[PDB]
Amino acid sequence: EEEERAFLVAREELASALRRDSGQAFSLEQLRPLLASSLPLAARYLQLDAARLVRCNAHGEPRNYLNTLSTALNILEKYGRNLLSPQRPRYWRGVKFNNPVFRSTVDAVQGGRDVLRLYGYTEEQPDGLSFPEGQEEPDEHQVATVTLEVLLLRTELSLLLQNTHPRQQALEQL
């Protein structure tokens, strides 16, 4: 409970840092307290369904599926950061399933789309996902916290690929 609190505090500091500067890059040294924790995934990923993201896409050699996952995660990170930009992109309100970059990266994994819903892309058109007309701007806290979790998971997978994750054997539990 105490370790869990320290984690949440660390999570909030990083999410706030993303709200001030959406282009802010985090070093592995910065992410260390979020990486070194022995807390379960459910207590560390509050918005992202990390276990389902990993487990439902673990098909074949890790060296391939972890790489595919990273690729989806890196693009999902860019979607989040763009929503935090002091100047939001024109057409931030919707993402098309048939976007070349979206199809080849995010739609390559199971649950890729659900992550856009966490950002606020809750409305479903057969062409893609949109914000509701009633939402005029993105909830910045929700967005920052999802973006951070997306970046954290990508960071975790990257160390697994390199075999340098602090809890590497305990994470191959799956």
Binding site: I75, K78, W92, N99, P100
Partner: peptide, 4 residues
């Protein structure tokens, strides 16, 4: 681009 991500929104096309």
């Amino acid at each position: 681009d991500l929104y096309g």
